Symmetry: D2
Subunit: 305 residues, 4 copies
Amino acid sequence: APKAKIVLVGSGMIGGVMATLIVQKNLGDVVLFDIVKNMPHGKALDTSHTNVMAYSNCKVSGSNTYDDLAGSDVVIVTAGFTNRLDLLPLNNKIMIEIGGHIKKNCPNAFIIVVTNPVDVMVQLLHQHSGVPKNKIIGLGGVLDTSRLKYYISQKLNVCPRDVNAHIVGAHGNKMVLLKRYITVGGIPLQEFINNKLISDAELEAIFDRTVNTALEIVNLHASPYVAPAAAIIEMAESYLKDLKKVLICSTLLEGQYGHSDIFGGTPVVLGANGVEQVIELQLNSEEKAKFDEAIAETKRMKALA
Amino acid sequence: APKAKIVLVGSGMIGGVMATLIVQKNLGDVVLFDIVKNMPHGKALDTSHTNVMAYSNCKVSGSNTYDDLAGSDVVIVTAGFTNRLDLLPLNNKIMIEIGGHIKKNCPNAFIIVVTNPVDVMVQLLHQHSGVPKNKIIGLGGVLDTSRLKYYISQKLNVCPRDVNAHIVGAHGNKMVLLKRYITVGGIPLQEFINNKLISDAELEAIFDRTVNTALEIVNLHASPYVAPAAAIIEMAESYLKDLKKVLICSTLLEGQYGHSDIFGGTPVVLGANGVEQVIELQLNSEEKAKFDEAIAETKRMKALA
Amino acid sequence: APKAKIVLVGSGMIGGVMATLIVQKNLGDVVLFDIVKNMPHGKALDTSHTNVMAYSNCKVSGSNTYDDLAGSDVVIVTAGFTNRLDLLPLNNKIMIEIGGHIKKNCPNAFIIVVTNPVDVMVQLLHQHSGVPKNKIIGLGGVLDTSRLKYYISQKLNVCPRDVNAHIVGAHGNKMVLLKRYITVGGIPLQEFINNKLISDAELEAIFDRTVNTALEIVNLHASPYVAPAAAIIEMAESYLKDLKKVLICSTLLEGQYGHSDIFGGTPVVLGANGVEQVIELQLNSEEKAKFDEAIAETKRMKALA
Amino acid sequence: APKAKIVLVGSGMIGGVMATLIVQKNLGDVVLFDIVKNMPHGKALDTSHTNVMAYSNCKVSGSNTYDDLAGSDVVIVTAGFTNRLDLLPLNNKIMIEIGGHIKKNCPNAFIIVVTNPVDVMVQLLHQHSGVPKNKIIGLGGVLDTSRLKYYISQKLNVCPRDVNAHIVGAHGNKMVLLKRYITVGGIPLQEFINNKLISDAELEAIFDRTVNTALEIVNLHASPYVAPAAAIIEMAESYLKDLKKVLICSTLLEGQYGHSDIFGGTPVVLGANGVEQVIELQLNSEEKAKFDEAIAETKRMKALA
Ligand SMILES: CCN(CC)CCC[C@@H](C)Nc1ccnc2cc(Cl)ccc12
Ligand SMILES: CCN(CC)CCC[C@@H](C)Nc1ccnc2cc(Cl)ccc12
Ligand SMILES: CCN(CC)CCC[C@@H](C)Nc1ccnc2cc(Cl)ccc12
Ligand SMILES: CCN(CC)CCC[C@@H](C)Nc1ccnc2cc(Cl)ccc12
């Protein structure tokens, strides 16, 4: 069947929601892969029954063998151990193992990396898998901006999706939030600030909140996995359905912002041909300085893998 | 049942698509009303069967009696005769007749006016129906900008919805297209122009195309009714589901842009409380001059009704 | 792009709704083809703008040249002149012309025939196009049963889709309604009759209503095209998304019900491989007698083409 | 806002998926309530961001105070300790506490009970909350039959939703699977058995699999919560949107099947008025004997609470 085959390399919390959302949207057949014995089979069985409730027809199966990567159209990697820097070499080993199988079983698959630090892990897998630069991206901006877009929408009382924002450079503490590129209903946010509808102080607090959301969720005795999963599926769906959505993801930089041979967060266009366009925001020197900071941290960690 | 009741006052071409789209989205019960005998019943019967194909449960009935306006949550007016100025007094008579029944049968319904010239006809109905200012709007910007957003998206090869634009003042020849407020993926269009991805000349042609689309469709031996219907439903749905989307519609101006006691196109926020916010774009003197032109034409025609 | 290409051979009323529904569901690129100059271009332009309102990315274009059949994944034929028997030879000529181009431009496309009498016209196109038997079907049962399912659901006050029914043999006056195969929520209808929830007399009236619905809609000064379009799209979507839905359509009979070398309405399974299964209902002699009647009328008209 | 308010009393695994699915479907505002400090707030924050990805506008908040039950339109109870019979009195205490607050804060809310044993726990809450019989149901048949419908659909290679089946009496080991009431595309399953498309032996194995699915998932080192959540949402959605779907749920029996003053699984119709119809299947003596067995076990456990 010409039905897309989506292999989720890692059957943890994010993997579970991704599987659920795929069936809900009837995106394609799903394989929940992991090295943990049977668990992926158990989650796959549970999820497979939702086909009835959702009027879908997507096979959902578990797997403990890399062989099931064969025929994969899309591969989503969430696998990985969770100082923080001590995991770098370890997770690189996981990227190496996965990359070798991708190269052997599905060299033409579209890859989405989630493993943290994503900006580092994505380039590592790109290198070990050998896939073209336009066929591999990392999760970052879609998730990070969903927080900023959401918090602003609540203050302004408008549909969350009506707020657009851009966070670039890298996923994580060094993420670059661009106040200048925020709009509401397509209108520059500054107009709403001029109107006293939202203050600069309110925005600064929202910015800090955005950068520290994962930490905030963790401190509330939970962990972020639902939004990450939803952000990942928006990306995968844009590719599978050739939507050509403009989404901020970690992609290989070839001179943009003055950086090369490194992956960084920036808006790109995802369609049937993968990363069809890499958009370079015309940042000013101040924003560029922050982007530089993001890249520096990515390079720092890359060197330790 | 707490199911919304949507009464379509006018069962023509736009009315038919609206009915179809309502069932597709299971938005609520539909009444296709018109003075033409039986036709609304015939279209209603045809459309009612689609409930099976769409897994919906919306009653779709025809009507030839104004009494069916009772219990209406949303009323959509497309009725109206189609120089052009000679129809003004005639269509005003239709607005008067409809307004009297709305006032009597559903004073708390949310009204959307389509009848042209919409900016004139909407204020007339507002006056004859007596509903609050936040409960009546006219179709305009959503439809007009859908053209501009779509044409630009094709030139740039991105998802149509990713292009945001603003057309204000009035629906029609005097519509004000604001080049300065166009974005792609939330990014100012000017950046794409600086990049040679789209030229100023290309945009000028797209602008003219946008203003003359209805005429273009008519010259191709067709008439626009599908997009208008879809634009209307996006508006009605934002209200019914309390989405709080920022949509450009004709609303009563109370000083915005320097105009009062007149309806004009401008972004507003539609939610459970109707027009929850009227957004005033901070236009420069040049854009304001064009808006003035739009209002002037509306006043001109209003005076002839 | 791996986006499906759907060519609508005939840009009339049914064609328009199909185009609209395809964009709503983001099913694939659409081509509105017809011999009428420009009209398809005009309808295509109007419909194309709805991509913004629906968050879709489907190209919608018009066409006046058969060449655009190239690359077609799905072809839907509604073209055709509308005694009634005098049109048979004329419409056969249309089927011949279309069939020659399908054979030349898209021999592997999946074909859905709507032209009436569908059961006759579908076999004619099958013959002239040369496509495999599993790649061509005619619209019939999905539309006819949607009426029966809907009317029964209203009497019983249950979701329309919860009522399942089977109408076979042929589309049209000789359609075979099988009372014995009607269920509500999967429960045999007879149980509801035993319960006095619906009477046999009520059902008989609903049956007559079902058979005469087109005529009823026509007498109300309208024409059925919305449900037909929706029924057609349910079929096309099952194929495109490999849903494997059980849908009653006109398919080539190879001995089922005692008939061969003729097309007739019967439940089939539509998936990525087209007609993946032809299901033969185990009818009793009485039901079989009626089916025979349906086939006889189809053969009668086939002989006059 | 006239937006429905859904309070999830219990913020565990099933609660999380329910919250996620509600936003995906934009069903209404969600409150994740639990006695565990902050966790519901953490899950609520994570889930709230998905509003952007799903184009929804549903508030998702956590809560540690029963007061938030005020204004609730729908209340879903999953809270509860997890011999097995020793938990009965304990879980009854939870039902009592919740029931008192429902009675005080939202007496007109529609209640769905999940806590096991559901058939027992649902009647207990019905008693402690005092809500009308038509406003409270327990999860059972929708989940159980989704397994049976799914397994059969895979053997027959048809859309999962096209297989309809009925499991009644009680949720759990004593569930009554009715082979006689299974259909495929509305066609009696027996016809497919006569055709050798599926054997009686295959079905017997599927039956055992259906009854032991939770156990099977648990043995694979997982736990069922995704399907349960999806089944619950289908029920809640039928009520909220007045779909009037026929769904098998635990409801108060008033003489049906010969049982009274007890809750049992049976098809019902859920609409704006809650349980609008309780459907009694015309079971034979053999099926009735099994149903009796189910009720007996429910009564046994009820007596120990
Ligand atoms: C002792 C166990 N070892 C080595 C035999 C297993 C392999 C270890 C490294 C390479 N890979 C992994 C380690 C841990 N988890 C993983 C999850 C997925 Cl999905 C894929 C690979 C993983
Ligand atoms: C001769 C016929 N006349 C007067 C009796 C009918 C009423 C005329 C004016 C007021 N109204 C109308 C005229 C024409 N079309 C309409 C469509 C709708 Cl939906 C509602 C009112 C309409
Ligand atoms: C005089 C005009 N003639 C002959 C040149 C045109 C061709 C006539 C027959 C074969 N075909 C047709 C006749 C009428 N309508 C049609 C609509 C479609 Cl979409 C496709 C073919 C059509
Ligand atoms: C020692 C802690 N006790 C008593 C103070 C808390 C209350 C205990 C019983 C009645 N209720 C409960 C016990 C355990 N979990 C629950 C989860 C939810 Cl959502 C609601 C009520 C719960």
